[PDB]
Amino acid sequence: QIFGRSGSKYVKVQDFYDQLGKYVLVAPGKFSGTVAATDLSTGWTMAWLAAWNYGDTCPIMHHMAAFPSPDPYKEFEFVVNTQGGKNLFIYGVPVTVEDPGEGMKIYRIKYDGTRMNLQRDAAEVSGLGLGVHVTITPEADGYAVGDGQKDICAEFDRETDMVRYAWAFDWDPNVKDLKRAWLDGGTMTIKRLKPTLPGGRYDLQGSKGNKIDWELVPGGELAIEDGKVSGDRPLHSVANDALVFDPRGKWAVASMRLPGVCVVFDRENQVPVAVLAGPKGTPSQFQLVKVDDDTWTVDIPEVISAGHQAGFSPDGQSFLFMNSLRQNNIMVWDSSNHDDPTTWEKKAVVESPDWRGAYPNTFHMVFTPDAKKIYVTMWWPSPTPNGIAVIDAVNWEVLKEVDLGPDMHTLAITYDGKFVVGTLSGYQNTASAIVVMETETDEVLGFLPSPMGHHDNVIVPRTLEDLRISRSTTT
Amino acid sequence: IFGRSGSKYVKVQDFYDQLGKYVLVAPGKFSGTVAATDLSTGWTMAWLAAWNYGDTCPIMHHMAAFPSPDPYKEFEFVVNTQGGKNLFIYGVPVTVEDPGEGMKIYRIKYDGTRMNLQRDAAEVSGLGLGVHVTITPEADGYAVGDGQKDICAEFDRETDMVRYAWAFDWDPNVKDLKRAWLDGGTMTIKRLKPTLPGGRYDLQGSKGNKIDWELVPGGELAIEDGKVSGDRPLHSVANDALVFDPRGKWAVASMRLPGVCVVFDRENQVPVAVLAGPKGTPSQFQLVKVDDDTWTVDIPEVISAGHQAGFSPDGQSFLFMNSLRQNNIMVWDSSNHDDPTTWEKKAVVESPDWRGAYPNTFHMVFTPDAKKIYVTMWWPSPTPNGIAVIDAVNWEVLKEVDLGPDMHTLAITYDGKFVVGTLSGYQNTASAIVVMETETDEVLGFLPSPMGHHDNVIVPRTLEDLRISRSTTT
Ligand SMILES: [Cu+2]
Ligand SMILES: [Cu+2]
Ligand SMILES: [Cu+2]
Ligand SMILES: [Cu+2]
């Protein structure tokens, strides 16, 4: 140890890192314009990258996901997207760039044991730019991006960065009044999106395709209803969030925020197979109707609540969709039947008197490796302290809530199940940190500095199995 | 005291509890950001990204913080930037054509929640300067130096207007970049007066530049080999900083290339002494007054470039590192506050591992009782950079610790207990905050810092604190 003259020992922070293991945390920084990998075994930032260095004129570094690497310390690859345009104006920061870049870039970056290397922009390769959740396929042979301004999600080939398939979603509201457009129901169309360009390419880079000028914020479903969200076709919006993956392969689920549904897709045969109904009180599913070989519809009598967070248990047994704002809860499906998602039926709802209000919103989660516990974020607007709720995933009950500080975002877990590692991001202008909480008795062990506005974080997985509790099955 | 797991798990909050209630602030160089960090909780308190404010080459560079009675409620600070071809000088494969010109001097106020960009004092005064930033010992102003333009100036805190500016020019004996300094020359020290309405300078951005980028450590060899582009490289002296004597009255401008520091009378606006850097030269060179606005000093040969420069917190010693051809710490007796002409060379700190070149000792900080100094040791990749502990009574190296790549600045908590510095991955690799306890001079470890920091401070509370902050040394 290190002793004073008094024989009292100094605290070495290295002692704190010793216990965490050999794990590499990565996180983008939103308005900071940077992305950073951290060695949780030493406290060092291993390498960071500033997209402005590459001529990016709106480097709002947004979602990300890391491919497994046998040894992350020697190398790993990862995907990180950006947003642009009026997403720049939506936080508490008096930005002065009135005409910023359009974003929707999808960067491929490789850490090489020393530095980050920006490989290319896959949105340029494919011509498809998408700016919300990034996930890796369970096979680690590609990745997926959702976007809630264009309402397009797509799975991409890891090697080529070419779109394997893309789905576009559209809203036909029963009542063409923004106030009632979702409440009073409507019909959502699912359309196969095909390349319109030479070389198998799309012509949907940057803001091409945008229905609204920014991604809705938490509870922003109120704001688009209230006419506060500008764009060409807000009545047509469904706010696609993510395409998450069944860890057993075959199925991918696209979350649609405004109509409160998730669409299960056959990855191989590239068709939709089921629509899951979010709000408590609705059946397990809504009816999928084929119109033609490229087009399907689903009618929703009414939208009781918006939904947001979506994903699978590591064993593929359960599927989860969070209702948010008008109901705050966790809706749970039995997805044990890997053969037929039309059989998936609701089996539980995690609820709490504490979720009475319009907040908190439960918009990120991570499961323990053994699928018995979930850690779920609790977000509020300033100044309410944000935190984590620990969920019993066997009985479907809230074990515990802890307060942390402002603007809680994502949660990752060391692959041995021992430590949850999360990010708080200051609403882009105030306090921000990495938080560490041990999963045995669920005690917060403290904070590490992180001067970034993280809307995502991952721990680099070693294996296909690690990926089941990484940015692949949940967001 | 304990939860359910008893003492099973290490809480990082213990680590911070011993550090006390101090706020670390640092700029991020290529990160384009600047950040304040609470050493008592491990939170970043606030961060600011200059690209948000239309900055197109946001190389956030040096900074200094004004004292505040409670830095957790509010504090003010000054951070400048670099631009043009300073963008192209590190390992990053940048793809920016027509980068911003930089040399902005941002005023930023932390208001207990957020950072607020107040203005660019370079736009206010018309004078942009891209190297060291310091606070006056009275905290009523600040100063900035520049080694591309060879200008330094002290500014009023309220108005952001120049109180005085100095321009420095080299007349080399031999008109050959190879010999322009080895073979000596005359350096001119000239009052710099404004040209524009309202007493404004016409020197923003890259206006005034002799060379296209600030000299890297050991980079005086690059300018000699004429691998530094620019209009007037033979005229370069590479001013580094303007530091302050904590007792007041005097400020000292460090000149890298001709190996000297110039002492200036602040209030009367005259240079009063030239301190000669290399071991082997006299205590001073002779100051010659040509008219009320112009002085010259002759330097037969330049034995070595110098860099770090500063005062002990009581003002008793003044130091200038030799840092190219010699590698040592040159020390002067500056106890005579009345007259800088009397200041005499009193010691040279030497070490067997200091040959050249590297390590480059370009930052330092003292303990509050002036008994010890902490000195960076910089090397290019892949040599381990680290810290040197200096005995400031006997003038010898106590200890050297290895840390990691690319060591930059060092600050100290104001009770004397913890040195906090930054390492910066040459802007593309590993970076961190380092904490070292001063009692036995041992490294407590590192904290994450995804930034390229070329500066960092602990926000001072009082004028006394400022003596060991970014005021007396760099
Ligand atoms: Cu989301
Ligand atoms: Cu976001
Ligand atoms: Cu310097
Ligand atoms: Cu620098």
CSV table of N, CA and C in Angstrom, one decimal, chain B residues 225-295:
chain,number,residue,atom,x,y,z
B,225,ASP,N,16.0,23.7,-39.7
B,225,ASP,CA,16.0,22.9,-40.9
B,225,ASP,C,15.1,23.4,-41.9
B,226,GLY,N,14.5,24.6,-41.7
B,226,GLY,CA,13.5,25.2,-42.6
B,226,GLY,C,12.4,24.2,-43.0
B,227,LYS,N,11.9,23.4,-42.0
B,227,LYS,CA,10.8,22.6,-42.2
B,227,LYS,C,9.5,23.3,-41.5
B,228,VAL,N,9.7,24.5,-41.0
B,228,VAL,CA,8.5,25.3,-40.5
B,228,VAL,C,8.2,26.4,-41.6
B,229,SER,N,7.0,26.3,-42.2
B,229,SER,CA,6.6,27.2,-43.2
B,229,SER,C,6.2,28.6,-42.6
B,230,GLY,N,6.2,29.6,-43.4
B,230,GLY,CA,5.9,30.9,-42.9
B,230,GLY,C,6.5,32.1,-43.6
B,231,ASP,N,6.1,33.3,-43.4
B,231,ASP,CA,6.6,34.4,-44.1
B,231,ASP,C,8.0,34.8,-43.6
B,232,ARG,N,8.2,34.8,-42.3
B,232,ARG,CA,9.3,35.5,-41.7
B,232,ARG,C,10.1,34.6,-40.6
B,233,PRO,N,10.4,33.4,-40.9
B,233,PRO,CA,10.9,32.6,-39.9
B,233,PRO,C,12.2,33.1,-39.3
B,234,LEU,N,13.1,33.8,-40.1
B,234,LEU,CA,14.3,34.3,-39.5
B,234,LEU,C,14.1,35.4,-38.5
B,235,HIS,N,12.9,35.9,-38.4
B,235,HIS,CA,12.6,37.0,-37.5
B,235,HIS,C,12.0,36.4,-36.2
B,236,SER,N,11.7,35.1,-36.2
B,236,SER,CA,11.1,34.4,-35.0
B,236,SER,C,11.9,34.4,-33.7
B,237,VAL,N,11.2,34.7,-32.5
B,237,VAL,CA,11.8,34.4,-31.2
B,237,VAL,C,10.9,33.4,-30.4
B,238,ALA,N,9.7,33.1,-30.9
B,238,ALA,CA,8.8,32.2,-30.2
B,238,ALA,C,8.5,32.6,-28.8
B,239,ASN,N,7.9,33.7,-28.5
B,239,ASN,CA,7.5,34.1,-27.2
B,239,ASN,C,6.6,32.9,-26.7
B,240,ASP,N,6.6,32.6,-25.4
B,240,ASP,CA,5.8,31.4,-24.9
B,240,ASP,C,4.7,31.9,-24.0
B,241,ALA,N,5.1,32.7,-23.0
B,241,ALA,CA,4.2,33.1,-21.9
B,241,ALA,C,4.5,34.5,-21.4
B,242,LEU,N,3.6,35.1,-20.6
B,242,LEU,CA,3.9,36.2,-19.8
B,242,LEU,C,3.4,35.8,-18.4
B,243,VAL,N,4.4,35.5,-17.5
B,243,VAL,CA,4.1,35.1,-16.1
B,243,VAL,C,4.3,36.3,-15.1
B,244,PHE,N,3.7,36.1,-14.0
B,244,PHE,CA,3.7,37.2,-13.0
B,244,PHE,C,4.4,36.9,-11.7
B,245,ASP,N,5.1,37.9,-11.2
B,245,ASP,CA,5.7,37.9,-9.9
B,245,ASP,C,4.6,38.0,-9.0
B,246,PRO,N,4.5,37.1,-8.0
B,246,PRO,CA,3.3,37.1,-7.1
B,246,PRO,C,3.3,38.3,-6.3
B,247,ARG,N,4.4,39.0,-6.1
B,247,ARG,CA,4.5,40.2,-5.3
B,247,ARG,C,4.0,41.4,-6.0
B,248,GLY,N,3.7,41.2,-7.3
B,248,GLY,CA,3.2,42.2,-8.2
B,248,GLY,C,4.3,43.0,-8.9
B,249,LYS,N,3.9,44.1,-9.4
B,249,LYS,CA,4.9,45.0,-10.2
B,249,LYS,C,5.4,44.4,-11.5
B,250,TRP,N,5.9,43.2,-11.5
B,250,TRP,CA,6.7,42.7,-12.7
B,250,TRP,C,6.0,41.5,-13.4
B,251,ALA,N,6.2,41.5,-14.7
B,251,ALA,CA,5.8,40.3,-15.5
B,251,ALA,C,7.0,39.9,-16.3
B,252,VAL,N,7.0,38.7,-16.7
B,252,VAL,CA,8.2,38.2,-17.4
B,252,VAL,C,7.7,37.4,-18.6
B,253,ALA,N,8.3,37.8,-19.7
B,253,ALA,CA,7.9,37.2,-21.0
B,253,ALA,C,9.1,36.2,-21.4
B,254,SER,N,8.7,34.9,-21.7
B,254,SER,CA,9.6,33.9,-22.0
B,254,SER,C,9.8,33.9,-23.4
B,255,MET,N,11.1,33.8,-23.9
B,255,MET,CA,11.4,33.8,-25.3
B,255,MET,C,12.1,32.4,-25.7
B,256,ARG,N,11.4,31.5,-26.4
B,256,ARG,CA,11.9,30.2,-26.6
B,256,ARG,C,13.3,30.2,-27.4
B,257,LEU,N,13.2,30.8,-28.6
B,257,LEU,CA,14.3,30.6,-29.5
B,257,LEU,C,15.6,31.3,-29.1
B,258,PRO,N,15.6,32.6,-28.6
B,258,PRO,CA,16.9,33.2,-28.2
B,258,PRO,C,17.3,32.9,-26.8
B,259,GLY,N,16.5,32.0,-26.1
B,259,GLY,CA,17.0,31.6,-24.8
B,259,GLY,C,17.0,32.6,-23.7
B,260,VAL,N,16.0,33.5,-23.6
B,260,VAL,CA,16.0,34.5,-22.6
B,260,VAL,C,14.5,34.8,-22.1
B,261,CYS,N,14.4,35.4,-21.0
B,261,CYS,CA,13.2,36.0,-20.4
B,261,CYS,C,13.4,37.5,-20.3
B,262,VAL,N,12.4,38.3,-20.6
B,262,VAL,CA,12.5,39.8,-20.4
B,262,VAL,C,11.6,40.1,-19.2
B,263,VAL,N,12.1,40.9,-18.3
B,263,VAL,CA,11.3,41.3,-17.2
B,263,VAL,C,10.7,42.6,-17.5
B,264,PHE,N,9.4,42.8,-17.3
B,264,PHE,CA,8.8,44.1,-17.6
B,264,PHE,C,8.2,44.7,-16.3
B,265,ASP,N,8.3,46.0,-16.2
B,265,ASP,CA,7.5,46.8,-15.3
B,265,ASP,C,6.1,47.0,-15.9
B,266,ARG,N,5.1,46.5,-15.1
B,266,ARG,CA,3.7,46.4,-15.5
B,266,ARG,C,3.1,47.8,-15.6
B,267,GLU,N,3.1,48.5,-14.5
B,267,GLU,CA,2.5,49.8,-14.4
B,267,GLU,C,3.2,50.9,-15.3
B,268,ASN,N,4.5,50.8,-15.4
B,268,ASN,CA,5.2,51.9,-16.1
B,268,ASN,C,5.5,51.5,-17.5
B,269,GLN,N,5.1,50.2,-17.8
B,269,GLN,CA,5.2,49.8,-19.2
B,269,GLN,C,6.6,49.9,-19.9
B,270,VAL,N,7.6,49.5,-19.2
B,270,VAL,CA,9.0,49.4,-19.8
B,270,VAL,C,9.6,48.0,-19.4
B,271,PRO,N,10.4,47.4,-20.4
B,271,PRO,CA,11.2,46.2,-20.0
B,271,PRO,C,12.3,46.8,-19.1
B,272,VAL,N,12.8,46.0,-18.1
B,272,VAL,CA,13.8,46.5,-17.1
B,272,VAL,C,15.0,45.5,-17.1
B,273,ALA,N,14.8,44.3,-17.6
B,273,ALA,CA,15.9,43.3,-17.5
B,273,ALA,C,15.8,42.1,-18.5
B,274,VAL,N,16.9,41.6,-18.9
B,274,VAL,CA,16.9,40.4,-19.8
B,274,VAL,C,17.7,39.3,-19.1
B,275,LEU,N,17.0,38.2,-18.7
B,275,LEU,CA,17.7,37.0,-18.1
B,275,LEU,C,18.1,36.0,-19.1
B,276,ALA,N,19.4,35.6,-19.0
B,276,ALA,CA,20.1,34.8,-20.0
B,276,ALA,C,19.9,33.3,-19.5
B,277,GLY,N,19.4,32.5,-20.4
B,277,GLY,CA,19.0,31.1,-20.1
B,277,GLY,C,20.1,30.1,-19.8
B,278,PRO,N,20.9,29.8,-20.8
B,278,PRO,CA,21.9,28.7,-20.7
B,278,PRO,C,22.9,28.9,-19.6
B,279,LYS,N,23.2,27.7,-18.9
B,279,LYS,CA,24.4,27.5,-18.1
B,279,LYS,C,25.6,27.9,-19.0
B,280,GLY,N,26.5,28.8,-18.5
B,280,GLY,CA,27.6,29.2,-19.3
B,280,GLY,C,27.5,30.7,-19.7
B,281,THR,N,26.4,31.3,-19.6
B,281,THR,CA,26.2,32.7,-19.9
B,281,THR,C,26.1,33.5,-18.6
B,282,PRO,N,26.3,34.8,-18.6
B,282,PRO,CA,26.1,35.6,-17.3
B,282,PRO,C,24.7,35.6,-16.8
B,283,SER,N,24.4,36.2,-15.6
B,283,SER,CA,23.0,36.2,-15.1
B,283,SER,C,22.0,36.9,-16.0
B,284,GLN,N,22.5,37.9,-16.7
B,284,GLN,CA,21.6,38.8,-17.6
B,284,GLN,C,22.4,39.2,-18.8
B,285,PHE,N,21.7,39.7,-19.8
B,285,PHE,CA,22.3,40.4,-20.9
B,285,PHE,C,21.8,41.8,-20.8
B,286,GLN,N,22.5,42.7,-21.4
B,286,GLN,CA,22.4,44.2,-21.2
B,286,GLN,C,21.2,44.8,-22.0
B,287,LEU,N,20.3,45.4,-21.2
B,287,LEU,CA,19.1,46.1,-21.9
B,287,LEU,C,19.5,47.4,-22.5
B,288,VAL,N,19.3,47.6,-23.8
B,288,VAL,CA,19.6,48.9,-24.5
B,288,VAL,C,18.3,49.6,-24.9
B,289,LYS,N,18.2,50.9,-24.5
B,289,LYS,CA,17.0,51.7,-24.9
B,289,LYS,C,17.2,52.6,-26.0
B,290,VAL,N,16.5,52.3,-27.1
B,290,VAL,CA,16.6,53.0,-28.4
B,290,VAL,C,15.7,54.3,-28.5
B,291,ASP,N,14.5,54.3,-27.9
B,291,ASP,CA,13.6,55.4,-27.8
B,291,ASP,C,12.5,55.1,-26.8
B,292,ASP,N,11.5,55.9,-26.7
B,292,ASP,CA,10.6,55.6,-25.6
B,292,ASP,C,9.7,54.3,-25.8
B,293,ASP,N,9.8,53.7,-27.0
B,293,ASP,CA,9.0,52.6,-27.4
B,293,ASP,C,9.8,51.4,-27.9
B,294,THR,N,11.1,51.5,-27.8
B,294,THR,CA,12.0,50.5,-28.4
B,294,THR,C,13.2,50.2,-27.6
B,295,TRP,N,13.5,48.9,-27.3
B,295,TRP,CA,14.7,48.4,-26.7
B,295,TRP,C,15.3,47.3,-27.4
